[PDB]
Amino acid sequence: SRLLLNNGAKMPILGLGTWKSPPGQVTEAVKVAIDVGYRHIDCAHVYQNENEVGVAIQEKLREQVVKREELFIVSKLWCTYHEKGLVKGACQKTLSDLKLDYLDLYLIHWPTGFKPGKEFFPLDESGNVVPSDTNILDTWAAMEELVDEGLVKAIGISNFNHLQVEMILNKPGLKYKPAVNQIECHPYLTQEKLIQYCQSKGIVVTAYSPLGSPDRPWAKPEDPSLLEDPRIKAIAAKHNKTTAQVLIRFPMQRNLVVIPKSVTPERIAENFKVFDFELSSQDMTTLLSYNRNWRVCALLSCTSHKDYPFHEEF
Numbered sequence: 455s456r457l458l459l460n461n462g463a464k465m466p467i468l469g470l471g472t473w474k475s476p477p478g479q480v481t482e483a484v485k486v487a488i489d490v491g492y493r494h495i496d497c498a499h500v501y502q503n504e505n506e507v508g509v510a511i512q513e514k515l516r517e518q519v520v521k522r523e524e525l526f527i528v529s530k531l532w533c534t535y536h537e538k539g540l541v542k543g544a545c546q547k548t549l550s551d552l553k554l555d556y557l558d559l560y561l562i563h564w565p566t567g568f569k570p571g572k573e574f575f576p577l578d579e580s581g582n583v584v585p586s587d588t589n590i591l592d593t594w595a596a597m598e599e600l601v602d603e604g605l606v607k608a609i610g611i612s613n614f615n616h617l618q619v620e621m622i623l624n625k626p627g628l629k630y631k632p633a634v635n636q637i638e639c640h641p642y643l644t645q646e647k648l649i650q651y652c653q654s655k656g657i658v659v660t661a662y663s664p665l666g667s668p669d670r671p672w673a674k675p676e677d678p679s680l681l682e683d684p685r686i687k688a689i690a691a692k693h694n695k696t697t698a699q700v701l702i703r704f705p706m707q708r709n710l711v712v713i714p715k716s717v718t719p720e721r722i723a724e725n726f727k728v729f730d731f732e733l734s735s736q737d738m739t740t741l742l743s744y745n746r747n748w749r750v751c752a753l754l755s756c757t758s759h760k761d762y763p764f765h766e767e768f
């Protein structure tokens with residue numbers, strides 16, 4: 455139910471995601487998740503709902519349903535705060551909203567830095583995203599000093615390709631290794647090379663968008679659906695489970711942490727019932743064979759950023 459991180463701490467293999475969780479529904483969603491047994495919540499400043507997540511975490515701590523040490527709370531540093539001087543301030547804002555005094559894990563959300571300001575995606579007059587001239591190594595040094603300050607227990611990365619991870623691992627004077635690389639992963643984008651790489655380096659991998667992110671704002675307008683894939687429905691029927699429960703169990707058997715998002719009380723409960731069954735090795739191989747290198751999250755407005763992660767093979 456928990457994986458060991460390089461800092462000695464143990465991270466719950468199942469967590470609740472909160473991207474697209476409306477402020478008016480996420481407090482209830484998080485309260486319900488904690489009642490159901492969830493101990494790991496995935497957050498981010500850019501989701502614009504950390505205040506409302508924090509209300510839920512506070513209510514459950516006050517009720518003594520959980521101790522703080524039992525909870526594993528994750529947030530992420532947005533691209534407009536990559537400058538060395540802004541990193542502490544971004545972290546502190548998140549800590550306020552969440553009403554916590556430390557984070558368990560703090561991630562660099564994307565390797566790309568943007569111009570600092572009030573817009574999450576600052577645009578020029580041609581409407582292109584304005585980059586910062588910062589680099590990955592300077593932002594990492596700022597994250598390291600968050601640990602020395604006691605603001606966060608562990609630091610990691612998100613959406614880094616293997617060369618970008620390499621770059622941090624080879625940093626002269628590297629003090630804290632990345633604990634976690636959080637990346638998109640499901641049967642259509644299986645990530646076998648990047649997962650072999652990080653796992654060889656002792657970096658834990660967290661699978662985001664495990665259900666294919668059916669609610670992502672962008673179109674595909676209609677088209678491909680994991681929850682509705684008839685081959686994946688077959689594997690679920692055979693186990694008397696739902697296809698969502700199969701999609702969540704899949705990354706767990708590859709030793710990944712997984713963070714399905716739901717604001718629906720019955721689905722939050724359904725998504726928790728994945729510890730009591732086992733996919734066969736035949737099932738696992740079959741699901742891996744469905745890979746079609748299809749990304750939900752390609753950050754398409756930054757495709758010419760100097761640090762865009764998805765031009766490399768893995």
Ligand SMILES: NC(=O)c1ccc[n+]([C@@H]2O[C@H](COP(=O)([O-])OP(=O)(O)OC[C@H]3O[C@@H](n4cnc5c(N)ncnc54)[C@H](OP(=O)(O)O)[C@@H]3O)[C@@H](O)[C@H]2O)c1
Pocket residue numbers: 470471472473474496497563612613636661662663664665666667668669681696698699713714715716717718721722724725751
């Ligand atoms: N680091 C990154 O760049 C990054 C990027 C994307 C996502 N993430 C993290 O990963 C989390 C999960 O990814 P995601 O939000 O893209 O989507 P997801 O977890 O793949 O799917 C979310 C959608 O699936 C639905 N759903 C949940 N359980 C279901 C079930 N049992 N049966 C049928 N439908 C179900 C949800 O509906 P309802 O909510 O209506 O129930 C929601 O519409 C995010 O919230 C975020 O925390 C991180």
